[PDB]
Scaffold this active site. Structure first.
Site, PDB file in Angstrom:
ATOM      1  N   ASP A  10      44.228  90.341  29.355  1.00 57.43           N
ATOM      2  CA  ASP A  10      44.415  89.360  30.416  1.00 57.43           C
ATOM      3  C   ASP A  10      44.145  89.982  31.785  1.00 57.43           C
ATOM      4  OD1 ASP A  10      46.099  86.486  30.765  1.00 57.43           O
ATOM      5  OD2 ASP A  10      46.221  87.839  32.485  1.00 57.43           O
ATOM      6  N   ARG A  11      43.291  89.324  32.578  1.00 58.10           N
ATOM      7  CA  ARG A  11      42.834  89.910  33.837  1.00 58.10           C
ATOM      8  C   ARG A  11      43.922  89.872  34.903  1.00 58.10           C
ATOM      9  NH1 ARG A  11      40.561  88.482  29.593  1.00 58.10           N
ATOM     10  NH2 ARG A  11      40.350  86.297  30.282  1.00 58.10           N
ATOM     11  N   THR A  12      44.625  88.741  35.024  1.00 57.85           N
ATOM     12  CA  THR A  12      45.710  88.634  35.993  1.00 57.85           C
ATOM     13  C   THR A  12      46.880  89.532  35.608  1.00 57.85           C
ATOM     14  OG1 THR A  12      45.120  86.418  36.759  1.00 57.85           O
ATOM     15  CG2 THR A  12      47.405  87.069  36.975  1.00 57.85           C
ATOM     16  N   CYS A  32      33.363  84.801  34.086  1.00 62.05           N
ATOM     17  CA  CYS A  32      34.782  84.941  34.421  1.00 62.05           C
ATOM     18  C   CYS A  32      34.869  85.453  35.844  1.00 62.05           C
ATOM     19  CB  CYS A  32      35.503  85.891  33.475  1.00 62.05           C
ATOM     20  SG  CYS A  32      37.236  86.161  33.969  1.00 62.05           S
ATOM     21  N   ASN A  33      35.504  84.683  36.729  1.00 54.20           N
ATOM     22  CA  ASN A  33      35.592  85.092  38.131  1.00 54.20           C
ATOM     23  C   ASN A  33      36.521  86.293  38.314  1.00 54.20           C
ATOM     24  OD1 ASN A  33      34.319  82.823  40.219  1.00 54.20           O
ATOM     25  ND2 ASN A  33      34.790  82.026  38.179  1.00 54.20           N
ATOM     26  N   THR A  34      37.718  86.263  37.701  1.00 54.89           N
ATOM     27  CA  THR A  34      38.663  87.368  37.896  1.00 54.89           C
ATOM     28  C   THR A  34      38.044  88.698  37.476  1.00 54.89           C
ATOM     29  OG1 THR A  34      40.402  85.778  37.196  1.00 54.89           O
ATOM     30  CG2 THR A  34      41.070  88.030  37.723  1.00 54.89           C
ATOM     31  N   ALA A  35      37.221  88.684  36.425  1.00 49.90           N
ATOM     32  CA  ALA A  35      36.614  89.916  35.938  1.00 49.90           C
ATOM     33  C   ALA A  35      35.689  90.555  36.959  1.00 49.90           C
ATOM     34  CB  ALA A  35      35.843  89.654  34.651  1.00 49.90           C
ATOM     35  N   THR A  66      42.305  81.830  39.669  1.00 45.06           N
ATOM     36  CA  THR A  66      43.499  82.496  39.160  1.00 45.06           C
ATOM     37  C   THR A  66      44.280  83.164  40.291  1.00 45.06           C
ATOM     38  OG1 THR A  66      42.392  84.613  38.737  1.00 45.06           O
ATOM     39  CG2 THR A  66      42.345  82.980  36.986  1.00 45.06           C
ATOM     40  N   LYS A  77      43.350  77.212  28.403  1.00 45.62           N
ATOM     41  CA  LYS A  77      43.131  78.359  27.525  1.00 45.62           C
ATOM     42  C   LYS A  77      43.900  78.234  26.210  1.00 45.62           C
ATOM     43  CE  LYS A  77      42.146  81.931  31.085  1.00 45.62           C
ATOM     44  NZ  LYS A  77      40.882  82.442  30.501  1.00 45.62           N
ATOM     45  N   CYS A 115      37.306  79.500  38.844  1.00 44.01           N
ATOM     46  CA  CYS A 115      37.756  80.004  37.553  1.00 44.01           C
ATOM     47  C   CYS A 115      36.982  79.203  36.520  1.00 44.01           C
ATOM     48  CB  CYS A 115      39.268  79.829  37.362  1.00 44.01           C
ATOM     49  SG  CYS A 115      39.852  80.004  35.666  1.00 44.01           S
TER      50      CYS A 115
HETATM   51  K   LIG Z   1      37.873  82.500  33.273  1.00 40.15           K
END
Ligand SMILES: [K+]
Ligand SMILES: [Cl-]
Ligand SMILES: [F-]
Ligand SMILES: [K+]
Ligand SMILES: [K+]
Ligand SMILES: [K+]
Lengths: 238, 237
Positions: free
Chosen positions: B52-54, B87-90, B128, B167, B197
């Site tokens: 999980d990125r967050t 994936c933006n957070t990535a 996110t 998700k 996101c």
């Molecule tokens: K995503």
């Protein structure tokens, strides 16, 4: 990546035949796997390299063979760590036994998966498929063994089913639906107790109209996805 | 002919799987093709065990970097010449990956900002918690002269909830959470809203008509950018 991908029971999708059907398969892997979160979904590697020659053009019109393309992308998936390979294209299963012999990964046939998901009471079954899937009898030997009787559209109607598939492959779902739906009604009128969607573009055309259709429609893409999930879930760590 | 010679695009996805399938859908829809054989050559990593990125960026959970690096190399070894990450957070790790990458990489952030109409100077941001907290869009937005509007803390918890509800597979519940936050951003003066996101476009899908301002689709923006990269080669059509 290779060894840990293999340990994780990664599934390889040998797709691109066509790309919309491959995308539809990915959606169905998400929809059919029970997952609490991103991390509980199935590990997948996808080949959506669609330069694979047209399958019906090869089998019925002497076009270039897709086999060597299929073989190359199969090995690409295995080398990436895929331990099981599924092919979201019915016509391509003309070469299934050939690919299985050269494969080190497990392969699961769309034909067996799809026939296994027909209700036992449905013995007279329509078949929507490409000209080559019908002409080479891909479903025929397996249907006979299960005691099924396949009904296919007449020559005029089958031309329209092929047109629908290739109209979908061209990107016009609305046109494909207007072409396909009278052929579904014709199959029911001739007594189909179920209809096999035996070309992976067919579910994309029918989507949104299953309620308007009297008889059950058997989704070959979903049947293959379900079979792959059962394979994935049979490991001691899964 | 090798996949590298054919300018194959690698999708470093699985973050999450539904968003990756959506990207594939959009590669079909946005590429003008007359038949199967005219579509973009694509290899997809939808291996979702990436942590999980967050959780990593905000709670010190396990880092996704080694997973992203591993699957990057998997895609390059299979023949990908260009890599895109739905994936933006990535993209917190985009520069690190680009350092170790042999293939071209195309940022979802640059592609998305480039698809904002030039008259939209005040732009809502749906993303996110970690994408907001680490400011992935801020410096690029400042360079373009944009003002980002993000939800207040209460609204943002509901945006985060909608993403995670999608998700988990409940689109209907995610929409019930998300749509009031869109109205709020509009009420506060958003002239466009970045769907920053890649699960947000899946929640909104089928409701852009009821939305009074343009929704900027980060996934579609990235697809369009990759298609342009593919089509720019002298030996492609
Ligand atoms: K995503
Ligand atoms: Cl890591
Ligand atoms: F098919
Ligand atoms: K599910
Ligand atoms: K097909
Ligand atoms: K298209």
């Amino acid at each position: 990546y290779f060894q840990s991908n293999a340990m994780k029971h990664t599934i390889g999708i040998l797709g691109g035949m066509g790309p919309a059907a491959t995308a539809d398969m990915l959606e169905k892997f998400v929809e059919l796997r029970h997952a609490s979160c991103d991390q509980q979904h199935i590990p997948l590697i996808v080949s959506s390299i669609p330069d694979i020659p047209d399958r019906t053009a090869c089998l019925l019109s002497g076009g270039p063979s897709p086999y060597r393309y299929l073989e190359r992308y199969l090995h690409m998936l295995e080398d990436a760590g895929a331990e099981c390979i599924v092919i979201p294209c019915n016509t391509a299963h003309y070469w299934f036994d050939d690919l299985q012999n050269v494969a080190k990964a497990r392969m699961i046939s769309i034909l067996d998966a799809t026939l296994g998901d027909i209700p036992p009471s449905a013995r007279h079954v329509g078949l929507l498929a490409t000209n080559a899937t019908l002409a080479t009898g891909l479903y025929q030997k397996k249907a006979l063994a299960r005691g099924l009787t396949l009904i296919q559209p007449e020559d005029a109607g089958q031309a329209l089913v092929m047109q629908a598939i290739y109209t979908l492959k061209r990107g016009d779902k609305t046109a494909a639906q207007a072409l396909l739906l009278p052929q579904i009604d014709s199959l029911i009128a001739r007594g189909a107790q179920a209809i096999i969607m035996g070309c992976t573009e067919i579910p994309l055309i029918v989507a949104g109209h299953e309620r308007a259709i009297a008889c059950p429609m058997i989704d070959s893409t979903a049947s293959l996805v379900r079979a792959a999930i059962r394979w994935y879930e049979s490991w001691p760590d899964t």
